[PDB]
Amino acid sequence: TKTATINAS
Amino acid sequence: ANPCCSNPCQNRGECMSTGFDQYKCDCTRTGFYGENCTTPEFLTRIKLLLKPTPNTVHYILTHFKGVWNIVNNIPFLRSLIMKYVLTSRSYLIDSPPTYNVHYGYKSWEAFSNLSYYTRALPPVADDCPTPMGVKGNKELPDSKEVLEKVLLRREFIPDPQGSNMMFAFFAQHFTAQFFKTDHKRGPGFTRGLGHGVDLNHIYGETLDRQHKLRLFKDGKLKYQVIGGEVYPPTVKDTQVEMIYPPHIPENLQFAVGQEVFGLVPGLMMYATIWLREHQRVCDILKQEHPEWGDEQLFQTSKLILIGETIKIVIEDYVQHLSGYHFKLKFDPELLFNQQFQYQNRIASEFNTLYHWHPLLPDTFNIEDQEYSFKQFLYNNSILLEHGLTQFVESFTRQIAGRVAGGRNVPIAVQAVAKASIDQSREMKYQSLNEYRKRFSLKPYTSFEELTGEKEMAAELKALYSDIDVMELYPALLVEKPRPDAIFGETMVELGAPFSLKGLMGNPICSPQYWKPSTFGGEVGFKIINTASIQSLICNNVKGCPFTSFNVQ
Amino acid sequence: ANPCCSNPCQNRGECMSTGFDQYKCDCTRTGFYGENCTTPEFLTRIKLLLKPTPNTVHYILTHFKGVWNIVNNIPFLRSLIMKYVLTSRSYLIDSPPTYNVHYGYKSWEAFSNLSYYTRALPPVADDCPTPMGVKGNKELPDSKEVLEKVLLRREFIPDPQGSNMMFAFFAQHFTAQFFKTDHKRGPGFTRGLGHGVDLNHIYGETLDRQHKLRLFKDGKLKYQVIGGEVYPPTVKDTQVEMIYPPHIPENLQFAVGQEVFGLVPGLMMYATIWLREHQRVCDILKQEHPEWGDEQLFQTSKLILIGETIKIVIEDYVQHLSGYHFKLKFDPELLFNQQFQYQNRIASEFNTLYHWHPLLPDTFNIEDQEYSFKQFLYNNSILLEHGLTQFVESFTRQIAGRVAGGRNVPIAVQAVAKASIDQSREMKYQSLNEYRKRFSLKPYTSFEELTGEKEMAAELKALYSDIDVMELYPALLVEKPRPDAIFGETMVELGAPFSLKGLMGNPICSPQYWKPSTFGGEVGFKIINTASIQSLICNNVKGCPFTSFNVQ
Ligand SMILES: *[C@@H]1O[C@H](CO)[C@@H](O[C@@H]2O[C@H](CO)[C@@H](O[C@H]3O[C@H](CO[C@H]4O[C@H](CO)[C@@H](O)[C@H](O)[C@@H]4O)[C@@H](O)[C@H](O)[C@@H]3O)[C@H](O)[C@H]2NC(C)=O)[C@H](O)[C@H]1NC(C)=O
Ligand SMILES: *[C@@H]1O[C@H](CO)[C@@H](O[C@@H]2O[C@H](CO)[C@@H](O[C@H]3O[C@H](CO[C@H]4O[C@H](CO)[C@@H](O)[C@H](O)[C@@H]4O)[C@@H](O)[C@H](O)[C@@H]3O)[C@H](O)[C@H]2NC(C)=O)[C@H](O)[C@H]1NC(C)=O
Ligand SMILES: *[C@@H]1O[C@H](CO)[C@@H](O[C@@H]2O[C@H](CO)[C@@H](O)[C@H](O)[C@H]2NC(C)=O)[C@H](O)[C@H]1NC(C)=O
Ligand SMILES: *[C@@H]1O[C@H](CO)[C@@H](O[C@@H]2O[C@H](CO)[C@@H](O)[C@H](O)[C@H]2NC(C)=O)[C@H](O)[C@H]1NC(C)=O
Ligand SMILES: CCCCC/C=C\C/C=C\C/C=C\C/C=C\CCCC(=O)O
Ligand SMILES: CCCCC/C=C\C/C=C\C/C=C\C/C=C\CCCC(=O)O
Ligand SMILES: CCCCCCCCO[C@@H]1O[C@H](CO)[C@@H](O)[C@H](O)[C@H]1O
Ligand SMILES: CCCCCCCCO[C@@H]1O[C@H](CO)[C@@H](O)[C@H](O)[C@H]1O
Ligand SMILES: CCCCCCCCO[C@@H]1O[C@H](CO)[C@@H](O)[C@H](O)[C@H]1O
Ligand SMILES: CCCCCCCCO[C@@H]1O[C@H](CO)[C@@H](O)[C@H](O)[C@H]1O
Ligand SMILES: CCCCCCCCO[C@@H]1O[C@H](CO)[C@@H](O)[C@H](O)[C@H]1O
Ligand SMILES: *[C@@H]1O[C@H](CO)[C@@H](O)[C@H](O)[C@H]1NC(C)=O
Ligand SMILES: *[C@@H]1O[C@H](CO)[C@@H](O)[C@H](O)[C@H]1NC(C)=O
C-alpha cells in the first residue's frame, strides 16, 4: 500500500 | 493376490502380509487397535468427539467478519490463531518421507532416492485384481470418456473468488520450481532435488547453470536492457543450455533458471520481475554492506527472495485461495515451541491435485488484443510488445476459471487433463475415498454427494459404478465447490498440509536461520517481512501498477 | 581485515560486518545480549547456576556403581536417565546445517550442497591477519614439530579402559560409511551423501554398485564359499571397483560396499561378518514371509542391519567408550515427546576429532604371529589363513593404545597425523578454545591446564606461545585424559552431540518408521532390539567366540 501510493504518484 | 490389496487397515494402521493369503495391521500410534485398527482408544474417542469438521471450521473462518476484524488487529490473537491453523495441519504428512511409486513399503531406497516424488498413500500393488485394489472392474473407465463427459469446458465458468491471470501465472511460475517431472524417467520422478521453495526456477538447479546466469558483480544476475527495460539475458551470451525453436530472434531467447518459462510470455513476465527483484535487493545490501563481495551479496539476496516468496505465498496467494476473513500470517516463530520437522519431500499427490488447468481462460486479453492459446505460447514478443506494465494491468483485470465445479477444463489443454488421469493410473494411485480417509475426511457415499448435483454425478455413476472406485484427480475437478469458492473440501484438505511443509519446512524458517544476521541485517530481514505481491510488482514494474490475485 | 576476525560475539551470537571496520553481533535466542552477547538474561543467569559441569556429570556417571545397579534394573528409571543424557546433548548441533569450508555465513549453497562436510564453527575468513583470526603469529607452528614433540609414540601407552582390536577396527569400519573424504575436491568435501549410518559401506553408495553386489535371490548379497566358509565375492565376479595394489591376485580382491576395505584384513573381517548377517536376516525374513520377493527381502534386511548397527553402537560401542556404570539405551521413543530433527549432516570437525590413530598397536598379533603395519596392509590372505574365529579371539585379546594422554601416535602412521594438522589448517579451523566455548566448555588458560602435566605443556607453550592459539586436533591427542579414561573432556563433549545426531537422527528412529511393520514384523523388530556385538559375532563366526570391545 504505502509503496504503491508514493511510487504511483 | 497381495492380502493387502483391499487396504484393510484403517486409521493409518499399516498392512503387512503374514503369509500368501493373510495380513496383519500395525496400529502403532494410530490411536486405535483391532485387526484393522478400527477400535478407538478411550482418549481417541474423546478427541474425535471434540474435533470439528473441516467444513465447520471453514465456515467459521469465512463468517463473523466483524470479530475476525478485531482478531486481525490483536497481534497476540492473530498469532494465536495462525498457530492453530498451522499445528492443525501438522500431524498429516509423513516426514521423514515413506513411500513412492515403486515402494509400497518403507525402504532405504524409497527414503534416500531424491529423484522420486514421495507418496502420501502407497501405490496399489501390481498383483492386485482391480486397479484400485479389489474393487471395481479389471479396468477403470476410459479417460477420454471421463474427460469429455465431466471435465471438458463447454461455457467458461468464472471463478467465484475472483482469481485473475496474475494468480494463474504465479501458480504456474511458483510451483514450477518443485514440480519438475522427469519425463525420461516417469511421472513419479522429479528433477527438483531441492524438493521445495529453493528458487531454482530463477537461479538454476545446478551450480554450472547458476554461474552462467550470474553477473559476478554486486551479487547480481546478468540481464539485458531492451528499450530501456531490464530483461533476462540471452542464450548466446550466457550459453546456458536451453534450445529455443530456431526461429526465435537471438535477443528473445531469454536465459532463466527454469528452461521451460522461455516459451510463455506470462511465465517470462514473472521471471523478469524476480530477476529485477534480485538485483534490487543486491543494490540494497550493497548499500548496507559496502564491505561485502559478490558471493555474499548474491547468496544473501537469494535467501531474502526465498523468504519474500514464502511471505507472499502465505499472506497473499494462500490468503486469497482460502477466502478466510482471518489474515494468514508468515511467522516461523509460531512453530518454535512445536514439534515440527524442517525438511520436506514433494509428494506425487501434491503435484496431481495441483493440475488446476480449469483456471486457464479461453483467450488471453492483453490491452486490446485477445490471443488464442496458440499465439500465446512460445511468443515472447507479446511481452516486449506490451511491456510488463500492460501485462500486469491486463492480467490483474482478467478473471480465471473455477477449478472445482466440473466441466471447466479448456479443450485447448485437454491432453494435459487426460495425462493427469492416465498418469495417476500409471503410478497406481489409490481411490479418491482412500485419500479422503488418509486425510481425515469422510468418504463419499454417492457420486451425487461428491458433485452436489445430478447430471455429472449420474454420468460418473455410469462410468465408475461404485463411488469407492472414483479417482482422485477427476473428483477434484468435479467436486461440489464450497459456498462460492474455487475449490471443494478434498482439494483444500489435501493441499494445505503439503503446502505448509513446503513453506514452513524451509531451512530459513528454522531457529538457527530465522534471525536478522542471516539476511544481512535488519534491513534485509524487513524485505522478507514486509513483502507482498503488490510491493514486488510496484518495486519492479515501471509505473507501479496496482495488482492483486483477485479481480478487484 | 574482516571486523569479525577476532570472533567477538560470544555465546553463539553471530558476527556480521556492518562496514569495513565495524561489526554487529546477532544475539537472537542466545539468552544473552550486549555488543558481544555477553550480558546474560535473568533465566540464563538461573540456568547457568544450575547446570553442573561435564566433569561433575562424568564423575557421577562413573561412581555410585551400586545405585546405578538399581537404576539399570528399573526400566522406568533407566529410560528416564537415558532421556536426560539424550536431551542434554540436543541443543548443541545446528540442524538444519549451516557453515562449511567455503561459507562463513549461511547461504543456500552451504545448505543445499551435500558434497560438503558441514561445520560446527565457520572457517576463519581468508583475509584475517593470523591463522586463528587475529591472535598468534602470521603462521602456526611447524606441524612436524608439534607431531614429533608431543604426538609421536615413544613407548606404547595402553588404553586404561581396555579397548581392544575388535573396537579399533569397528571404529574404523563403522565410521568409514560416513567419513568418506572426497580427496579430488578437498578435505572439506565428502562422498557420503547419505551423511550418516546408511550402511553404504556394505551395500554401496550407488544403486549401480548395490546391484552388482546383490544376488537377486532371497534378497541376499552375493558371496563365495572358500573352504566351506562364506566370504564376499571378488572384483572379477562382480566387477565392483575396489582399491587393490597391482600384485594382489584376483581370488583375493573381494568386492564389498566400501572400495577401501581391502586395505586392512581387520576391515575385510567386519565386511564378511555383516555380509553374513545380511543373509542371515534374509533367511529369517524369508521364513516369516514366504510370500515376499527379493527386493523386499533385501530392503527390509538393510533396514534391520541399520537398526542393529545403531543398537550396537550405543549399547556396546559408546557404552564402552563412556565408562559409565549407567547402561546406555537405544530407544527412539525416548525422543518422541521431544523437539528433535530427524536429519543429519556430517561435520568436518566430527571427522577431525575422530582421527583416533593412537589406538593402533605397534604390531598386530593374530594367534601366534605378529604382523607389522607393512605385512598387514592389503593382506587378505592373513584373514583366510587364520579365519574369522581366530581373528576375533585374537582381536578380542589385543589391547589398543590410549588416545588422549599425548605421544601415542604410531610412527608408522605419522603422515596421517600430520595431515590432520595440515588439513585442519587448510580448512581454516578456529582455535581449540573457540571450539571449547562452542560446546559450552570452559576455555583453557594454560597449556599445563590442558595436558595436566609440564613437559609436553612446556613444549606446546614454546611452539604456540598463547593457549588461545592452540589447535583442536593436537590438543585432543595431548589433553589430560579423565581418571583412567581413554579421552579427555573436549573429545567427549564435541563428539557426543555429533554422534547422537548421526545415530538418533536416522529416519528409522522417527515415529513413522519406528514400528514392527517397518522391519517385517515383531521378529525383524526383535533382531534390532536384541542386537549386540557378541550376537553379531556369535551368529556369524564359526564357534561363536566370546567377544567384546574391552580386553576382558
Ligand atoms: C533412484 O532410483 C532410480 C529408479 O530405480 C534409479 O534409476 C534407475 O537406476 C538403474 C541403475 O543405475 C538404471 O538401470 C541401470 O542398469 C542397467 C543394467 O546394469 C548393467 O549395465 C552395465 C553397464 O556398465 C554392465 O556393466 C552390467 O553387466 C549390467 O548389464 C543399465 O542398462 C542402465 O543403463 C542403467 O545403468 C535405471 O535405468 C534407472 N532408470 C532411471 C534412468 O530412470 C536411480 O539411479 C536412483 N538414484 C540414485 C541416486 O541412486
Ligand atoms: C558443491 O560445491 C562444489 C564446490 O563448489 C561444486 O564443485 C565445484 O563445481 C564447479 C562448477 O561445476 C566446478 O568448476 C566448474 O567450472 C569451470 C568453469 O566454467 C566453464 O567451463 C565450461 C565448460 O563447458 C564453459 O562452457 C564455460 O565458458 C566456463 O569456461 C570448469 O572449468 C570446471 O571443469 C567445472 O565444470 C569445480 O571444479 C567444482 N569442484 C569440485 C570438482 O570440487 C559442486 O558442483 C557442488 N555440488 C552441487 C550438487 O552443486
Ligand atoms: C477387518 O477387515 C477385513 C478386510 O476388509 C474384514 O474381512 C472381510 O470380512 C467380511 C465379513 O466376514 C467378508 O465379507 C470379506 O470377504 C472379508 N475380507 C475382505 C478382504 O473384505 C474383517 O471382517 C475386518 N475385521 C474386523 C474385526 O472388523
Ligand atoms: C566487545 O568485544 C570487542 C571485541 O573483542 C571489544 O573491543 C575491544 O575492546 C578493548 C578495550 O576497549 C580494546 O583493547 C580492543 O582493541 C577492542 N577491539 C578488539 C577487536 O579487541 C569490546 O570492548 C567488547 N564490548 C563490550 C561492551 O564488552
Ligand atoms: C503456512 C501455510 C498454512 C496453510 C493452511 C491454511 C489454509 C489453507 C487454505 C487454502 C489453500 C487452498 C488449497 C490447498 C492446495 C494447494 C496449496 C496452494 C499453496 C502452495 O502452493 O503451497
Ligand atoms: C545415542 C547416544 C549418544 C551418546 C551420548 C552419551 C555419551 C557420550 C559418551 C562417550 C562417547 C565418547 C566420545 C565421543 C566421540 C565420538 C562418538 C562415537 C560414537 C559414534 O561414532 O557415533
Ligand atoms: C460460532 C460457531 C458457529 C458454528 C456453526 C458452523 C456451521 C458450519 O456448518 C457447515 O455449513 C456448511 C454450509 O455452508 C455445510 O456445507 C457443512 O457441511 C456444515 O458442516
Ligand atoms: C493454470 C496453471 C495451472 C498450473 C498447475 C500445474 C500443476 C502441475 O505442474 C506440472 O506437472 C507435470 C507433471 O504431471 C510436470 O511435468 C510439469 O512440468 C509441471 O509444471
Ligand atoms: C550428590 C552427588 C555429588 C557429586 C559431586 C561430584 C563432584 C565431581 O567433581 C569433579 O571431580 C573430578 C575428580 O575426579 C575433577 O577432575 C573435576 O574437575 C570435578 O568437577
Ligand atoms: C622410538 C620412537 C621415537 C619417537 C621420537 C621421534 C622424535 C623425532 O624424530 C623423528 O622420527 C620420525 C619417525 O621415525 C623420523 O621420520 C624423523 O626423521 C625424525 O626426526
Ligand atoms: C584406529 C582407527 C581410527 C579410525 C578413525 C578414522 C577417523 C577419520 O577417518 C578418516 O578421515 C580422513 C579425513 O582426513 C579420510 O580421508 C579417511 O578416508 C577416513 O577413513
Ligand atoms: C508473436 O507475437 C506477435 C506480437 O504480439 C504477434 O503479432 C504474432 O502474431 C505472433 N507470432 C506468431 C507466429 O504467433
Ligand atoms: C601376507 O600374509 C602372509 C600370511 O600371513 C604372510 O606370511 C606374508 O608375509 C604377507 N606378505 C607380505 C608381502 O607382507
| Rounded CA separation C533/C308 (Å) | 9
Q: Ligand 2 in contact with C113 (CB < 6 A)?
A: yes
**Residue B141 sits in the same domain as residue B22:** no
Instruction: Provide the H-helix boundaries in B289-409.
Output: 294-312, 319-322, 348-353, 381-397
Phi, psi of B87 (to 5 degrees): -70, -25
Q: Provide the sign of the torsion angle of the four alpha carbons B491, B497, B500, B503, taken in this order.
A: negative
Contact A4 B538 (CB under 8 A): yes
Which CATH number is B4's domain given? Answer: 2.10.25.10
Inter-helix orientation angle C294-312/C522-529, to 10°: 30
Which secondary-structure segment (H or E) carries B448?
A: helix B447-451
- Report the nearest atom of ligand 3 relative to the CA of B34: 27
Query: For strand B364-366 and strand C32-33, is the pairing parallel, antiparallel, or unpaired?
Result: unpaired
Contacts of C193 (CB under 8 A, 6+ apart): C114, C115, C205
Contact A4 B543 (CB under 8 A): no
Please answer whether residues C479 and C457 qualify as being in contact, where contact means their C-beta atoms are separated by less than 8 angstroms.
no
Which secondary-structure segment (H or E) carries C33?
A: strand C32-33
Please answer whether residues C526 and C532 qualify as being in contact, where contact means their C-beta atoms are separated by less than 8 angstroms.
no
**Ligand 9 centroid to residue C52 C-alpha, Å:** 10
- Give the type of residue at C492: V
B538: distance to nearest CA of chain A, Å? 6
| Rounded CA separation B99/B117 (Å) | 9
| Rounded CA separation B528/B310 (Å) | 9
Residue of A nearest to B543 (CA): A8
C249: distance to nearest CA of chain B, Å? 34
Burial of B43 (0-12, 13-18, 19+ CB in 10 A): exposed
Q: Ligand 7 in contact with B249 (CB < 6 A)?
A: no
Contact C106 B518 (CB under 8 A): yes
| Rounded CA separation B85/B218 (Å) | 40
Residue of B nearest to C103 (CA): B296
C-alpha separations of B378 from B224, B242, C139 in Å: 20, 14, 60
Residue of C32, C38, C520 whose CA lies nearest to C283: C520
Contact B535 A7 (CB under 8 A): no
Contacts of C503 (CB under 8 A, 6+ apart): C197, C310, C313, C314, C330, C509
**Ligand 5 centroid to residue C69 C-alpha, Å:** 53
Q: Residues of A at the B interface (Cβ-Cβ below 8 Å)?
A: 1, 3-4, 7-8
**Residue B8 sits in the same domain as residue B74:** no
List residues in chain C that are followed by a break over 2.5 Å (C to N): none
Which CATH number is C447's domain given? Answer: 1.10.640.10
**Other beta carbons within 10 Å of B126:** 8
Residue nearest to atom 13 of ligand 5 (CA): B492
Q: Ligand 7 in contact with B96 (CB < 6 A)?
A: no
C-alpha separations of B279 from B298, B312, B401, B456 in Å: 9, 19, 34, 51
Using CB atoms, which chains have 3+ pairs under 8 A with C?
Answer: B
**Residue C301 sits in the same domain as residue C334:** yes
User: How big is the B-C interface in CB pairs under 8 Å?
Assistant: 131
Q: Which residues in chain B have their CB less than 8 angstroms from residue A2's CB?
A: none
Residue nearest to atom 14 of ligand 13 (CA): C375
Separation of first and last alpha carbons in chain A: 12
DSSP state of B99: B
Nearest ligand to the CA atom of C149: 10
Contacts of B459 (CB under 8 A, 6+ apart): B149, B150
Range of the domain at C23: 1-41
**Residue B178 sits in the same domain as residue B214:** yes
Q: Which residues in chain A have their CB less than 8 angstroms from residue B543's CB?
A: 8
The tally of domains found in chain C comes to 2
Number of H helices, E strands in chain C: 24, 8
Residue of B nearest to C30 (CA): B512
Cell numbers at C405, concatenated: 594422554
**Ligand 9 centroid to residue C482 C-alpha, Å:** 11
Residue of C428, C434, C361 whose CA lies nearest to C125: C428
| Rounded CA separation C496/C55 (Å) | 14
Helix H, strand E, coil C: the string for C200-245 is HHHHCCCHHHHHHHECCCCCCECCEEECCEEECCEHHHHCCCCCCC
Q: Which residue, among B94, B206, B291, B343, would best test binding to C if mutated, counting the most C CBs under 10 Å from its CB?
A: B291
| Rounded CA separation B532/C392 (Å) | 66
**Residue C249 sits in the same domain as residue C281:** yes
Using CB atoms, which chains have 3+ pairs under 8 A with A?
Answer: B
**Residue B36 sits in the same domain as residue B84:** no
**Other beta carbons within 10 Å of B85:** 18
Residue of B nearest to A9 (CA): B543
DSSP state of C363: S
Residue nearest to atom 2 of ligand 10 (CA): C154
Please answer whether residues B478 and B150 qualify as being in contact, where contact means their C-beta atoms are separated by less than 8 angstroms.
yes
**Residue C10 sits in the same domain as residue C153:** no
Q: Ligand 10 in contact with C411 (CB < 6 A)?
A: yes
User: How big is the A-B interface in CB pairs under 8 Å?
Assistant: 18
Instruction: List own/partner pairs for B209-216 with CB under 8 A and 24 or more apart.
Output: B209/B240, B209/B241, B209/B257, B210/B257, B212/B238, B212/B239, B212/B240, B212/B255, B213/B238, B213/B240, B213/B255, B213/B256, B213/B257, B214/B298, B216/B294
| Rounded CA separation C124/C136 (Å) | 13
Residue nearest to atom 13 of ligand 11 (CA): C181
Q: Which residues in chain B have their CB less than 8 angstroms from residue C17's CB?
A: 289, 291-292
Contact B516 C112 (CB under 8 A): no
C226: distance to nearest CA of chain B, Å? 31
Number of H helices, E strands in chain A: 1, 0
**Residue B20 sits in the same domain as residue B103:** no
| Rounded CA separation B187/B348 (Å) | 8
Residues at CB less than 6 angstroms from ligand 4: C 6, 8, 34-36, 38
With vertex at residue C53, the alpha carbon angle to CA C436 and CA C496, rounded to the nearest 5 degrees, is 55
**Residue B33 sits in the same domain as residue B46:** no
- Give the determination technique: X-ray
**Other beta carbons within 10 Å of C159:** 26
Helix (H, G, I), strand (E, B), or coil: what is residue B133? strand
Helix (H, G, I), strand (E, B), or coil: what is residue A1? coil
| Rounded CA separation C314/C329 (Å) | 7
**Residue B15 sits in the same domain as residue B97:** no
Touching status, chains B and A (3+ beta-carbon pairs under 8 Å): yes
- Report the nearest atom of ligand 1 relative to the CA of B184: 43
**Residue B4 sits in the same domain as residue B72:** no
Q: Ligand 6 in contact with C62 (CB < 6 A)?
A: no
Any idea of the CA torsion for C473, C478, C480, C482, to the nearest 10 degrees? Answer: 70
Residue nearest to atom 2 of ligand 5 (CA): B500
**Residue C84 sits in the same domain as residue C36:** no
Which of B36, B39, B437, B468 to probe ligand 3 with, by most ligand atoms within 8 A of CB?
A: B36
